[PDB]
Amino acid sequence: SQASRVLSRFVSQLRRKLERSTHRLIADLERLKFLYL
Amino acid sequence: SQASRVLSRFVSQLRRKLERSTHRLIADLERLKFLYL
Amino acid sequence: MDVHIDNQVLSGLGTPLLVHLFVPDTVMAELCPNRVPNCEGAWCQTLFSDRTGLTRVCRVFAARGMLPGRPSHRGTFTNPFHVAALRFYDEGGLVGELQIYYLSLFEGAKRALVRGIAHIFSPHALYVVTYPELSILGAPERE
Amino acid sequence: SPEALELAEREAERARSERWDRCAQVLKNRLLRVELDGIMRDHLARAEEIRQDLDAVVAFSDGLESMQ
Amino acid sequence: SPEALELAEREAERARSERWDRCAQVLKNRLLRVELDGIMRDHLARAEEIRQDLDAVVAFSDGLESMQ
Amino acid sequence: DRAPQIIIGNEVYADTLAAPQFIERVGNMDEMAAQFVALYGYRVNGDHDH
Amino acid sequence: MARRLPKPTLQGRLEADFPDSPLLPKFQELNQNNLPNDVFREAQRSYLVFLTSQFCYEEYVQRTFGVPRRQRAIDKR
Amino acid sequence: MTCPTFTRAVRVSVDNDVTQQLAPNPADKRTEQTVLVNGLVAFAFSERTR
Q1: SS3 per residue for B1-37
Q2: Does F47 sit within 8 Å of G54, measured CB to CB?
């Protein structure tokens, strides 16, 4: 019950934000390719 | 008994692999700074 | 530092936003030859490329400063890709125009609150203060 | 002498073009160094979010047996 | 005196004309472009590795609850 | 305490945080036995004059 | 590269010489391919210099280490 | 292996002492020195050894 509340929602909170740094490099290195290069 | 060896050691392995991307991006971007720039 | 609140009570209520910038004497060595005079009359203006053109002229008083606890900042205190220009005079024969740029400032305003930035026009390091109340290539070329 | 005028313009065109080549390469180098610093700070700035939320997961998981 | 005026102009012509040459090369930009793609491939590799480990840890968490 | 400037060729060098930009660090010989191939290759491939 | 000191007087044919070095087959990896003759010959001579220097440092590393207690203990009989 | 590349000259330009700080020209304040990097100092050669 409460184990399903904790150890799934918090892993989803981990994964949905561990995708963010990948998306951030996807944004910023392509920003370098278009902007200063 | 079991879950403290489960839900702590595996999380420790996950964090010790999370730190590798930070240190690698430090090393790679400084290498870009020094070697080609 | 007093110049910021002076502006915010007299000119900051006439102009919306302000970025408070401190210039080392080494950066001052670019414009002025063989002189170190105090920089009261220095006129900062904005100038933005490729859309429309306008300048707004204002004095921020400059005084030499010992107030940084860091030894390194010992010295004078006064759409990104565009220009600001400081026109500096004294009673004698000395007129200089200095060009500050953006993307040193918006990145620099990130946290004595101080951070080092680089000049594009006349490359040296400048230092930006942040107060607790707070098409590339064609853009320089036109002038 | 009218013939030397052209020569003066040719040498001047060479110098004015070289000034732009040198200025453009220097500004590209300095601004690219700045953006490598920027992407360094960017990846650190969301690695902070990663570690704050990891510590949130562990800090609330220590309260799991106080919420069961 | 015109003699020393001419001599200063002549030595001046020598050094002042010598100051003219400048150099630039193209290949540095292309190598600089290649290195970014290499580092992007490397970051994607480590990201997918740690994603597979993160997906595996949840499976271990479901698997070892049986032992209690 | 006085402000230094380091003129290495044409570039100037002021701040401490830009230290491994212009200055390179070379460790002891037993440690540097990882990198020696590149250490020869830059002696041949690389451009010293700039 | 603009002005270099002239090349020091050396005897040649150290590659095709009578003595046979274990480094020699790895040296066979380099080929002229693009280069003209004299450039490639002096470049490969420099590469052989690099190989011999690596061999000298490796042998010095193995030389310096010392002698074990166990071998001198066996040296009784 | 760790043999460095060609010798160079690097000019260190610093401000003078604060007791001697007074000048109209800020560029006059700096005193400057060129350090030889990776190079040695030597006596006069013979002509046979030249």
Answers
A1: CCHHHHCCHHHHHHHHHHHHHHHHHHHHHHHHHHHCC
A2: no
